[PDB]
Short mmCIF file of C-alpha atoms (C1' of nucleotides) and ligand atoms in Angstrom, two decimals:
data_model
loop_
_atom_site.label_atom_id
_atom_site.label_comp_id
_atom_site.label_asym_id
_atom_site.label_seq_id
_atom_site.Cartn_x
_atom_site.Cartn_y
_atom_site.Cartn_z
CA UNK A 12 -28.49 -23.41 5.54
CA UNK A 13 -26.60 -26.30 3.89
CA UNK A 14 -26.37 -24.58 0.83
CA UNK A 15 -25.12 -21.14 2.26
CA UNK A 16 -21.20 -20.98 1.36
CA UNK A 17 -19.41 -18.56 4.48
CA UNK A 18 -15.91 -17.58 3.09
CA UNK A 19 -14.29 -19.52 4.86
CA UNK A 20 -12.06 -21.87 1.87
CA UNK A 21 -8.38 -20.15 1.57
CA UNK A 22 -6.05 -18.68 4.64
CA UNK A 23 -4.95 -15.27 3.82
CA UNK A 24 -2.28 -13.05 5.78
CA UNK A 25 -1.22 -9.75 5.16
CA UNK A 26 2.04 -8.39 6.06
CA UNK A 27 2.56 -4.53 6.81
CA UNK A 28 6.54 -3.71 8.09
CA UNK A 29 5.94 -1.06 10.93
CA UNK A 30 7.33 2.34 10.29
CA UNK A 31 9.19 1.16 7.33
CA UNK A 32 11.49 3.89 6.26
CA UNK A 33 12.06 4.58 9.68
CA UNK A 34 13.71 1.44 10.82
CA UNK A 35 15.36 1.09 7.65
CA UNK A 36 17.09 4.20 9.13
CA UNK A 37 17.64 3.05 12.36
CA UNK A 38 18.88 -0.28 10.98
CA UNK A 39 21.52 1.68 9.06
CA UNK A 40 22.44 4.39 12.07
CA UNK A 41 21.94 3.20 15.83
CA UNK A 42 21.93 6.52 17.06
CA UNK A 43 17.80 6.35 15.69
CA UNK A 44 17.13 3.44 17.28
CA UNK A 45 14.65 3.61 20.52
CA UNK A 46 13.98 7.25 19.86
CA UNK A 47 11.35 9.90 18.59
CA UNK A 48 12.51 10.20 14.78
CA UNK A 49 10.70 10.58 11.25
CA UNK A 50 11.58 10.12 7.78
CA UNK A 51 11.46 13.66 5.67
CA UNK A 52 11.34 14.04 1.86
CA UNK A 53 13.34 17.42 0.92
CA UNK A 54 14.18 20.33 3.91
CA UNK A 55 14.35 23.93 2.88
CA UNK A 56 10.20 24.12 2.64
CA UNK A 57 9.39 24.11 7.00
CA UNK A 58 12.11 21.66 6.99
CA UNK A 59 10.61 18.82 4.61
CA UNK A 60 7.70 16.92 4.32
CA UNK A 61 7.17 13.85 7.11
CA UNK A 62 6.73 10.96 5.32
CA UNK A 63 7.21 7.97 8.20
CA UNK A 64 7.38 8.44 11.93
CA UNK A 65 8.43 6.48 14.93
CA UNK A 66 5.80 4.99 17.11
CA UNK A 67 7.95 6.92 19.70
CA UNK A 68 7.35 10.08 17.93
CA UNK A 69 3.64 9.33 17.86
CA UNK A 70 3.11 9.78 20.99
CA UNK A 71 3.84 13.22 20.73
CA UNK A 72 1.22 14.10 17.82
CA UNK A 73 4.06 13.86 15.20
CA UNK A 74 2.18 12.26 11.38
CA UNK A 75 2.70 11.87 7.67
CA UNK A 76 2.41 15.18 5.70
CA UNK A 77 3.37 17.35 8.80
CA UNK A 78 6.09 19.52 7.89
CA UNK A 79 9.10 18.99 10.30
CA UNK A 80 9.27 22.22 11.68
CA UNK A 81 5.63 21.70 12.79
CA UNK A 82 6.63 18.05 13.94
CA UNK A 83 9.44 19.35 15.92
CA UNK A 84 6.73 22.35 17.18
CA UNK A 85 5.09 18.60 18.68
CA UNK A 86 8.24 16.85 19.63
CA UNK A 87 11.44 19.42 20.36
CA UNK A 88 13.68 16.15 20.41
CA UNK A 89 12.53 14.40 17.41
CA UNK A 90 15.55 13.38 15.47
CA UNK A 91 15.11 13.19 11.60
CA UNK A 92 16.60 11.40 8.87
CA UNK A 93 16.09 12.78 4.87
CA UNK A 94 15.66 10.93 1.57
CA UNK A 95 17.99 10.56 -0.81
CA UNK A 96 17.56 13.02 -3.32
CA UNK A 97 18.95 12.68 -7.11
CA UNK A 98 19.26 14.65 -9.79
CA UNK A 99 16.72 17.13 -7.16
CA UNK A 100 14.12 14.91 -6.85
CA UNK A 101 13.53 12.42 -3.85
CA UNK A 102 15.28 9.00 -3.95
CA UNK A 103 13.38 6.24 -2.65
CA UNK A 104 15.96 3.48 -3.60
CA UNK A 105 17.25 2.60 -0.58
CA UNK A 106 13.69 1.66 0.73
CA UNK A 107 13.18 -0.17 -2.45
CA UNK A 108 15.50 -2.53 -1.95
CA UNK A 109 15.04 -3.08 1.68
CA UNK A 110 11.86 -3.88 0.58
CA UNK A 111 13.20 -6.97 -1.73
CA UNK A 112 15.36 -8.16 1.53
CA UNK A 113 11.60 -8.95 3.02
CA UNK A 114 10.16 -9.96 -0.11
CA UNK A 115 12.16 -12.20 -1.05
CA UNK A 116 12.08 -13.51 2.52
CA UNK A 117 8.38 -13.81 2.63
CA UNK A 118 8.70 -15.54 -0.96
CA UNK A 119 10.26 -18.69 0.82
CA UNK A 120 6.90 -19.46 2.61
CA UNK A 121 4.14 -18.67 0.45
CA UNK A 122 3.57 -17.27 -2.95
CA UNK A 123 3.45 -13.40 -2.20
CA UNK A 124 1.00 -10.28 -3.61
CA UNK A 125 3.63 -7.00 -3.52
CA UNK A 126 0.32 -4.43 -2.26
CA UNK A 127 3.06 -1.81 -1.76
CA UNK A 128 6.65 -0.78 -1.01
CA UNK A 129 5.79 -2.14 2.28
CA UNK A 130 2.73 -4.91 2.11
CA UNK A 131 2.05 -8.77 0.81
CA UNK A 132 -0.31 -10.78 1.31
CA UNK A 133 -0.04 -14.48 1.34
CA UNK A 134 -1.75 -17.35 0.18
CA UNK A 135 -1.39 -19.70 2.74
CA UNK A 136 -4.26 -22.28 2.46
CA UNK A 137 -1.61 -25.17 1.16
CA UNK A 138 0.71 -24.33 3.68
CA UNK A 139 -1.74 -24.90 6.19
CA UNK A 140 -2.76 -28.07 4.97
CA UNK A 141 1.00 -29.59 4.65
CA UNK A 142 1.64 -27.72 8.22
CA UNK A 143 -1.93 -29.72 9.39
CA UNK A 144 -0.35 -32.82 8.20
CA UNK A 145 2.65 -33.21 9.94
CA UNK A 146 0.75 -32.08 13.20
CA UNK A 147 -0.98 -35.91 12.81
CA UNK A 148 -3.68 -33.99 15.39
CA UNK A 149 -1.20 -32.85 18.15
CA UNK A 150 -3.03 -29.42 19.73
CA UNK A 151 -0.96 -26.22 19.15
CA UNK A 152 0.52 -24.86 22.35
CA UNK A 153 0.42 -20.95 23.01
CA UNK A 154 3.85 -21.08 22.74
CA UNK A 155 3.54 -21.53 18.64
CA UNK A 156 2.02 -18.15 18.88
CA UNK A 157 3.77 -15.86 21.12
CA UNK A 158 2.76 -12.77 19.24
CA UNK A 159 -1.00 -13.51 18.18
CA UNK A 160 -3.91 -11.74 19.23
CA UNK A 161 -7.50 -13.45 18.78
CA UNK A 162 -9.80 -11.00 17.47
CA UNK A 163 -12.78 -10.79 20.16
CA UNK A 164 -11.04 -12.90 22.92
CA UNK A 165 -11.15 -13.04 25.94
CA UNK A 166 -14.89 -12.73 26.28
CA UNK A 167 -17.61 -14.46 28.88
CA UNK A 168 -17.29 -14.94 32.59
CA UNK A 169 -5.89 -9.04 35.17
CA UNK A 170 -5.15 -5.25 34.15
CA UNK A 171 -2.10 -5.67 31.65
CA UNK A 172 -2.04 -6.12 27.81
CA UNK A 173 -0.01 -8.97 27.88
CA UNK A 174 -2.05 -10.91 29.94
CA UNK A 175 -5.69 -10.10 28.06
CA UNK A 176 -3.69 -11.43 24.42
CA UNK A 177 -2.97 -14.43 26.61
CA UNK A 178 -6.15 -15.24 28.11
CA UNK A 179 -8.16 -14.86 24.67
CA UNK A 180 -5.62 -17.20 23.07
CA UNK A 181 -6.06 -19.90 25.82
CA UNK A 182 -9.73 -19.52 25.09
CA UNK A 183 -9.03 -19.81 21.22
CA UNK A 184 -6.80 -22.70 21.73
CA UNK A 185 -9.21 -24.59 24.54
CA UNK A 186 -11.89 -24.15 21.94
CA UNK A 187 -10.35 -25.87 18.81
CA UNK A 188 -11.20 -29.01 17.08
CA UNK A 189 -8.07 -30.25 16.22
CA UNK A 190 -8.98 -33.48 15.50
CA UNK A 191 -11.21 -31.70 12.40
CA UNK A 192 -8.77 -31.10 9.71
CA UNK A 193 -11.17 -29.06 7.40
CA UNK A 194 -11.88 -26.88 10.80
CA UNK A 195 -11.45 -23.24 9.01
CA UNK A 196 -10.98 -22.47 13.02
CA UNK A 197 -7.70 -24.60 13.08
CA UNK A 198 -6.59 -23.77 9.53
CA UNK A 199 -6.72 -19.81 10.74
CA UNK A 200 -4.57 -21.03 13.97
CA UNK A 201 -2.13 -23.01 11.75
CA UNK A 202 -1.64 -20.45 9.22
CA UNK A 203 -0.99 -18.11 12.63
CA UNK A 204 1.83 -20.54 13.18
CA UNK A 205 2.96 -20.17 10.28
CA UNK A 206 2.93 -16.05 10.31
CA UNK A 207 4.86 -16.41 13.55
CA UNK A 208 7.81 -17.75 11.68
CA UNK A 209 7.70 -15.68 8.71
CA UNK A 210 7.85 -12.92 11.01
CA UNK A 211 10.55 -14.16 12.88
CA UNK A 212 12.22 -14.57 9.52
CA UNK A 213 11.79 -11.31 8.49
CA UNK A 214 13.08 -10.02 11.64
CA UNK A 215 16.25 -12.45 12.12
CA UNK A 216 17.28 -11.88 8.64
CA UNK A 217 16.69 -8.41 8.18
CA UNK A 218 16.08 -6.64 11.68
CA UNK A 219 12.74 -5.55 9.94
CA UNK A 220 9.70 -5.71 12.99
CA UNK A 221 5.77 -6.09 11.17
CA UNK A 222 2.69 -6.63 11.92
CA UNK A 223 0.29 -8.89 10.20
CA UNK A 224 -2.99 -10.16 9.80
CA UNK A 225 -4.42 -13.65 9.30
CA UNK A 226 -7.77 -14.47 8.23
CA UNK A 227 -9.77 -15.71 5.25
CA UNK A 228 -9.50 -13.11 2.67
CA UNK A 229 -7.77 -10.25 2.29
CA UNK A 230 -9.97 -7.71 3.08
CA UNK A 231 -10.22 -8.81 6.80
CA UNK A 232 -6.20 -9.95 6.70
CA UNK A 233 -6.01 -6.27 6.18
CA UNK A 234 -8.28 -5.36 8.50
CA UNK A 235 -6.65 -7.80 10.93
CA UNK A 236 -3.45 -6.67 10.42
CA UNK A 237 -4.25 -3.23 11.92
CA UNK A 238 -6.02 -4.38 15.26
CA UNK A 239 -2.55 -4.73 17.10
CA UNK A 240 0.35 -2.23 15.77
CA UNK A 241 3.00 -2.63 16.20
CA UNK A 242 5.46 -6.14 16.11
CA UNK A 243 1.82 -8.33 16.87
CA UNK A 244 -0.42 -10.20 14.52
CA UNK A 245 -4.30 -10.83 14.83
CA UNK A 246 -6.09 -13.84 13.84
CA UNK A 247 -9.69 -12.58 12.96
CA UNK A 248 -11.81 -15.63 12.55
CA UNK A 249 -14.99 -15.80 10.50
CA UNK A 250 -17.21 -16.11 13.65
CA UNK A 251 -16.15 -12.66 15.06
CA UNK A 252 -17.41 -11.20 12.48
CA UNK A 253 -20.48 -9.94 13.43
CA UNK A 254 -19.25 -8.53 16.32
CA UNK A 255 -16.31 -6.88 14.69
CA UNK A 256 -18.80 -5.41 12.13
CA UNK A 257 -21.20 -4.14 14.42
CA UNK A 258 -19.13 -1.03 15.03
CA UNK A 259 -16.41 -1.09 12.61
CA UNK A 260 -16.98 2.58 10.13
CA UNK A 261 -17.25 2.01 6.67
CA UNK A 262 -14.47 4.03 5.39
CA UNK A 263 -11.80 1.30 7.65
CA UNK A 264 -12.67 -1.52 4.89
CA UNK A 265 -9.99 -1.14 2.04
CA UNK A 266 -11.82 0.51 -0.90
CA UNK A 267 -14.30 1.70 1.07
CA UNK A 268 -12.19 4.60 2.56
CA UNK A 269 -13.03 7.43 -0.62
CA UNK A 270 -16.40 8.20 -2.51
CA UNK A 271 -17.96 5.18 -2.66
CA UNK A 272 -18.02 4.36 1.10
CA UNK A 273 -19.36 7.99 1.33
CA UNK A 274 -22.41 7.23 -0.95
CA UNK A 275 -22.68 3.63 1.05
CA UNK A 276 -23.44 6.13 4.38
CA UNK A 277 -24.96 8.59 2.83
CA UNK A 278 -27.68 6.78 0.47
CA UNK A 279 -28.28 4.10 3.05
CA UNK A 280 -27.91 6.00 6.29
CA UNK A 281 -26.02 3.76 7.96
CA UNK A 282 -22.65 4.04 9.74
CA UNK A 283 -21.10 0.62 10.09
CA UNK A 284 -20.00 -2.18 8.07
CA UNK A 285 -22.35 -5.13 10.09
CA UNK A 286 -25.21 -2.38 9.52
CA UNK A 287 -24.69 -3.71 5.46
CA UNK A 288 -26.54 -7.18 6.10
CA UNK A 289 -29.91 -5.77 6.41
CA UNK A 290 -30.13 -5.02 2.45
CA UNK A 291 -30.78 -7.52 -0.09
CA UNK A 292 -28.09 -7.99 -2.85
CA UNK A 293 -30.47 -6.75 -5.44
CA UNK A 294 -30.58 -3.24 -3.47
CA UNK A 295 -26.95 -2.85 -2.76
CA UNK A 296 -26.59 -3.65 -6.60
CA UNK A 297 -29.24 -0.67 -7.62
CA UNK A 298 -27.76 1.73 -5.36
CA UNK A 299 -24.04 1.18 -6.56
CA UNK A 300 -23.89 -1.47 -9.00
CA UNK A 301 -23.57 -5.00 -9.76
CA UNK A 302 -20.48 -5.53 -9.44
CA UNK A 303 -20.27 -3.28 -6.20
CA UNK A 304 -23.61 -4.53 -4.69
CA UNK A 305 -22.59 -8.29 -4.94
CA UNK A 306 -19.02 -7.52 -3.11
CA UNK A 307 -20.64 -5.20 -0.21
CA UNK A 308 -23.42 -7.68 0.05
CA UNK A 309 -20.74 -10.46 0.54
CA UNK A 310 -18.35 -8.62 2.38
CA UNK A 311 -20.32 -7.23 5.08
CA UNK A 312 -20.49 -10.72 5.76
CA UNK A 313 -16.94 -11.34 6.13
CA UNK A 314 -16.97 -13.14 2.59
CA UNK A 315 -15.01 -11.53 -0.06
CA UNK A 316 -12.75 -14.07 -3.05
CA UNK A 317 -10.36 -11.28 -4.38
CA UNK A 318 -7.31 -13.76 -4.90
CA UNK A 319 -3.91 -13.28 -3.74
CA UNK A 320 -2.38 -12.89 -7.42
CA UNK A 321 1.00 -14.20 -7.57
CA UNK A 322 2.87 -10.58 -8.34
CA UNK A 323 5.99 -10.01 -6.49
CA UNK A 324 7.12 -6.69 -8.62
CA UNK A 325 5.54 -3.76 -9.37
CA UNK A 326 3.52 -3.69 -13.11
CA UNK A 327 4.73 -0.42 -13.65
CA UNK A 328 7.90 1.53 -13.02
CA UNK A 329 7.38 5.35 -12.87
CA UNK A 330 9.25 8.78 -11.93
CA UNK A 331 7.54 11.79 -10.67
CA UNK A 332 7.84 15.16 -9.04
CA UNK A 333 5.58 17.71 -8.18
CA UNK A 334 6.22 21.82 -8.41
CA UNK A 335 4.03 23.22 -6.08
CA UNK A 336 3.43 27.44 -5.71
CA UNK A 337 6.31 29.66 -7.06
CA UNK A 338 7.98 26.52 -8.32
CA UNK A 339 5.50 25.39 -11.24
CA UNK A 340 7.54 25.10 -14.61
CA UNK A 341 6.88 28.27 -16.71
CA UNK A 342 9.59 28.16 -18.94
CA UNK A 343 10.19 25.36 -22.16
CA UNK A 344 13.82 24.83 -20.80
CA UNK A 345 12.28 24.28 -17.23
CA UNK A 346 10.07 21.27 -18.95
CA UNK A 347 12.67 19.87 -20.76
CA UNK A 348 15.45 19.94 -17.89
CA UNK A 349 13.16 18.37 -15.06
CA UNK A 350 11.97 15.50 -17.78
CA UNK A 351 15.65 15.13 -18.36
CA UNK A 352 16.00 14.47 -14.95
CA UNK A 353 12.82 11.94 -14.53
CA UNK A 354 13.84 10.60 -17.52
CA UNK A 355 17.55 10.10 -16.44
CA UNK A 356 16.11 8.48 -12.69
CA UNK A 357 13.99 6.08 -14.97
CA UNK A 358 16.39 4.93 -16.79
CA UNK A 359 18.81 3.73 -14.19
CA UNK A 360 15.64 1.85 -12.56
CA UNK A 361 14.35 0.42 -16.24
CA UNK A 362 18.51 -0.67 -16.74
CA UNK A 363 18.43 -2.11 -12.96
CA UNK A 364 14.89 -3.83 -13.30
CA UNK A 365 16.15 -5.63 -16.96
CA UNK A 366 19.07 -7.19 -15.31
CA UNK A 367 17.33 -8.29 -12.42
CA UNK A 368 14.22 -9.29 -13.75
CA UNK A 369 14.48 -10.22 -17.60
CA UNK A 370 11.81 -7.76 -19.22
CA UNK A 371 11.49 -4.76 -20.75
CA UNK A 372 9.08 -2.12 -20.75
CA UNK A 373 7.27 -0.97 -24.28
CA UNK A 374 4.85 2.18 -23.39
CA UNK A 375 5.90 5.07 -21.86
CA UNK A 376 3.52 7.33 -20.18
CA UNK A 377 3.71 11.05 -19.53
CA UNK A 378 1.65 12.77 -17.24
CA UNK A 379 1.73 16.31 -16.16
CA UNK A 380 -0.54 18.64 -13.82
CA UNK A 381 -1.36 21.85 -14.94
CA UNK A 382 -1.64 24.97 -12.96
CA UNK A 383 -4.92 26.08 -11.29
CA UNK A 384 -6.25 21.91 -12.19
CA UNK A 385 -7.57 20.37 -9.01
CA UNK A 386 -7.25 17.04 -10.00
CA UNK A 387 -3.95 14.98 -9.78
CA UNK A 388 -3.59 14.67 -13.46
CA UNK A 389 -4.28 17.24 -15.91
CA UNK A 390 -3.00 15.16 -19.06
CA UNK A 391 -1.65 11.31 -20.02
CA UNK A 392 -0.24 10.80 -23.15
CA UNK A 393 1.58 7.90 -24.37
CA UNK A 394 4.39 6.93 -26.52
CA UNK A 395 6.20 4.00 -27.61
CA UNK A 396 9.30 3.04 -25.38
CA UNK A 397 11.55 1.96 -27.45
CA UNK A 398 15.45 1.97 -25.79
CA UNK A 399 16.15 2.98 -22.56
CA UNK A 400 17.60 5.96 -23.10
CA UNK A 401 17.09 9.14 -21.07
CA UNK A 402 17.60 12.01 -23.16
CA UNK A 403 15.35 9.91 -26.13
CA UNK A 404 12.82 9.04 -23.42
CA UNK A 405 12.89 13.02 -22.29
CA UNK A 406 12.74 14.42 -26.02
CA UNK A 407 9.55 11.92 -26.65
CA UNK A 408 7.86 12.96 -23.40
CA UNK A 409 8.04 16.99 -24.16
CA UNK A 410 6.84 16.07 -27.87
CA UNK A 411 4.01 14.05 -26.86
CA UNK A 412 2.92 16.89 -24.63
CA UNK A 413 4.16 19.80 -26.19
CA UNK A 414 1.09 21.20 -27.57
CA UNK A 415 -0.74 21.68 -23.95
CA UNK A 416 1.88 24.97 -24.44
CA UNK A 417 -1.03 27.92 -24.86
CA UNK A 418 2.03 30.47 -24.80
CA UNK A 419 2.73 31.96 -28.23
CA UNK A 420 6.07 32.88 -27.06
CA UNK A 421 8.30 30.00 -28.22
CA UNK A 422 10.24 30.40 -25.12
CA UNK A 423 7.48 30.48 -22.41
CA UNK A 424 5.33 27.57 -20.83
CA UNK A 425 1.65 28.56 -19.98
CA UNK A 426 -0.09 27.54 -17.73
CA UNK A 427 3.05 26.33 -15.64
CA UNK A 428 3.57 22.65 -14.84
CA UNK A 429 2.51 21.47 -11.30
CA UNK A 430 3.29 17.91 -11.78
CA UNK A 431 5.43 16.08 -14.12
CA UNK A 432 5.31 12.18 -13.99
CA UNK A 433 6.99 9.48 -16.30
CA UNK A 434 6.03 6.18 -16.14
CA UNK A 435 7.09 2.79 -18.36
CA UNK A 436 4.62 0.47 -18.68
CA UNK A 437 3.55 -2.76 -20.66
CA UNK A 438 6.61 -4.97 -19.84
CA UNK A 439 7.39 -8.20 -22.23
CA UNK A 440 9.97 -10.70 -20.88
CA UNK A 441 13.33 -10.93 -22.16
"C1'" DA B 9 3.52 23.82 -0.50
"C1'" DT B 10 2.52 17.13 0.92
"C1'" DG B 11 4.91 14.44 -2.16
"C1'" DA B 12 6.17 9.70 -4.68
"C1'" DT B 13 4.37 6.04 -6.52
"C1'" DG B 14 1.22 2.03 -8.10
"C1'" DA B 15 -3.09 -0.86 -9.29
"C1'" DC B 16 -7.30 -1.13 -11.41
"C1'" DG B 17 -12.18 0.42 -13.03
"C1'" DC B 18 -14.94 2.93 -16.62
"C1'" DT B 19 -15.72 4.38 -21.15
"C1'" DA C 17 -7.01 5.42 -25.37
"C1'" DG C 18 -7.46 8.72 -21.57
"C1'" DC C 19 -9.54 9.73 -17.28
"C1'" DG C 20 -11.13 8.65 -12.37
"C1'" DT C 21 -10.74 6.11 -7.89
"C1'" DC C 22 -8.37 4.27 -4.11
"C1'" DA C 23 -4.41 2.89 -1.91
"C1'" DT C 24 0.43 2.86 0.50
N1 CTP D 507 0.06 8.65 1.99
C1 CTP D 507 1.02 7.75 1.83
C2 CTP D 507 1.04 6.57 2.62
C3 CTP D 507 2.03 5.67 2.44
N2 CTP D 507 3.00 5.90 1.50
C4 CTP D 507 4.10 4.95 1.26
O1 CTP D 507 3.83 3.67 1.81
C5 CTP D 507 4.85 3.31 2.76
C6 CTP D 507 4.24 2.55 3.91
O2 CTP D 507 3.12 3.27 4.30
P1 CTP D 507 2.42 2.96 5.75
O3 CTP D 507 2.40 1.49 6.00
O4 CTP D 507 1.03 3.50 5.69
O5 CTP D 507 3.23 3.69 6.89
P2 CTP D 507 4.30 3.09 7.89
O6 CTP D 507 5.41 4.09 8.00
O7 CTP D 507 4.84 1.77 7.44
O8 CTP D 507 3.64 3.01 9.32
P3 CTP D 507 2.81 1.74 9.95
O9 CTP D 507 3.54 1.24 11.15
O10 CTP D 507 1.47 2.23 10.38
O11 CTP D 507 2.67 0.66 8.93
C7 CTP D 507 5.38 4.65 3.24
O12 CTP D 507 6.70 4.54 3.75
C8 CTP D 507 5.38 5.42 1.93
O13 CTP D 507 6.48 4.99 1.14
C9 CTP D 507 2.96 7.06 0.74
O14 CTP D 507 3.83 7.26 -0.09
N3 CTP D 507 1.97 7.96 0.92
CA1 CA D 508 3.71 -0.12 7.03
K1 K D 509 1.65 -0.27 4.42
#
DNA sequence: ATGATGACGCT
DNA sequence: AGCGTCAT
């Protein structure tokens, strides 16, 4: 009872940009705009690889990982726009730094996470409270939060969308104590308010739509975030929980999507997340450990304390580039040329990311795929990273991994390379 | 023949 | 260290 903490001590939002590469295209040619269009990675394999997609193109079927000429099979108009690609590998720079245009954007508001090329969350608990005191008690009108869906509204005793986000917001908002200011209730709505103008932020600034989340961790910001797609935000409070739970799968609860969310169904027999609440924390911690019991047992109660950890760049920076069929590297001037050319790419990003951001990486880490190996890596070997320096960087890569040659020819590479991968790693400031 | 990254857990 | 898991 009075004892019995509920989750409910930080505001956390997470921001996902909608069909990112694809309206960094459109921002950069019109003729994309308002249309059916994806984002492809290469072209002369069934016309490259989809990697974003339109929520115009959607509608026709069109995904990630369809091949365009399939895609097109879907959607006869669907207009496409292709990576850069470097030294014959894919390119992402461009999304990169359209990424750092939001970033830095978000930065202004809150301390930021970086979850992706695409995704932050946000700390926004002391926000809130600063927001809280200048409101002196004054209710929030709707008009604050154009955008904002309340998860589980309208409820109790018109046909359109617009009009149900309304009506469950005027029940939110006719429901709030905002005379309370520890009310985790109003805190959510402020830090809503808040969301509204980072978003229109983003958008004014950059021309970048998103969608976001607000809530009290980041599990359910993330969880949130993906209720209304695209350009909305959804405010999931701790009370509509249960019901949210009660048929929410498993596998939809970040982390929970791979193995271990298949062993949580399949051990316990359940299907749903609320489902979770009718173990003790002992049993969850038998079945799948301590450390894995105590978070389901928590979070299946809409409780989770991950923090948002103040990270704004990536840990790592790494190259990579698969060889898939007829194209795995079976010669030694094959391995050497393509880690010339990761190595080369990594090195203008390592250069680029020292200026910018006073450190330098000390580790580098080579990882290759061999042919016939199921798993995504084969090998990881490291070496010490000494000056950024491609063809040094290239030379130390093929000797740290030289040996996995079974050929006796000197000349030949057996079994060919399906995946070569360089990554620098263990950055010190400077 | 999805492909390009990136974080973190386990041992 | 080196591998496995999960994600965007
Ligand atoms: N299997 C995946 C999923 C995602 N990404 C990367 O993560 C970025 C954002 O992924 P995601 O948010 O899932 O897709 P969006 O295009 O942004 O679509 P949405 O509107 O649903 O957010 C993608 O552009 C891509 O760079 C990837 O490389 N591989
Ligand atoms: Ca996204
Ligand atoms: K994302």
């Amino acid at each position: 009872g009075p004892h019995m903490a509920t989750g409910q001590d930080r505001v956390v939002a997470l921001v996902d940009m909608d069909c990112f590469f694809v309206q960094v295209e459109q921002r950069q040619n019109p003729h994309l705009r308002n249309k059916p269009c994806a984002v492809v990675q290469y072209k002369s394999w069934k016309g490259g690889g989809i990697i974003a997609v339109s929520y115009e193109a959607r509608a026709f079927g069109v995904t990630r990982s369809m091949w365009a000429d399939d895609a097109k099979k879907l959607c006869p108009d669907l207009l496409l726009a292709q990576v850069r690609e470097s030294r014959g590998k894919a390119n992402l720079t461009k999304y990169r730094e359209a990424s750092v245009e939001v970033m830095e954007i978000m930065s202004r508001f809150a301390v930021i996470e970086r979850a992706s090329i695409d995704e932050a969350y946000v700390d926004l608990t002391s926000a809130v409270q600063e927001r809280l005191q200048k409101l002196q008690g004054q209710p929030i009108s709707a008009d604050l939060l154009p955008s904002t869906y309340i998860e589980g509204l309208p409820q109790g005793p018109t046909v359109q969308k617009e009009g149900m986000r309304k009506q469950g917001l005027f029940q939110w908002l006719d429901s709030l104590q905002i005379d309370n200011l520890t009310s985790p209730d109003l805190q959510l709505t402020v830090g809503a308010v808040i969301v509204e103008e980072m978003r229109a932020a983003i958008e004014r600034e950059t021309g970048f739509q998103c969608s976001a989340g607000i809530s009290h961790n980041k599990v359910l910001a993330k969880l949130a975030c993906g209720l209304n797609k695209p350009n909305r935000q959804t405010l999931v409070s701790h009370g509509s929980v249960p019901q949210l739970f009660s048929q929410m799968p498993i596998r939809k609860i970040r982390s929970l999507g791979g193995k271990l969310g298949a062993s949580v169904i399949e051990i316990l027999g359940i299907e749903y997340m609320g489902e979770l609440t009718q173990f003790t924390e002992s049993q969850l911690q038998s079945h799948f450990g301590e450390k894995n019991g105590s978070w389901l047992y928590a979070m299946c109660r809409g409780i989770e304390h991950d923090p948002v950890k103040p990270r704004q760049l990536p840990k790592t920076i790494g190259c990579s580039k698969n060889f898939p069929g007829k194209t795995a590297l079976a010669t030694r001037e094959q391995v050497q040329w393509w880690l010339l050319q990761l190595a080369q790419e990594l090195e203008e990003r390592l250069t680029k990311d020292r200026n910018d951001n006073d450190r330098v990486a000390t580790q580098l880490v080579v990882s290759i795929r061999v042919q016939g190996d199921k798993r995504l890596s084969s090998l990881r070997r490291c070496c010490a990273l000494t000056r950024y320096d491609a063809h040094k960087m290239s030379h130390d890569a093929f000797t740290v991994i030289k040996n996995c040659n079974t050929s006796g020819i000197q000349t030949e590479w057996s079994p060919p390379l399906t995946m070569l991968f360089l990554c620098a790693t263990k950055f010190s400031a400077s």
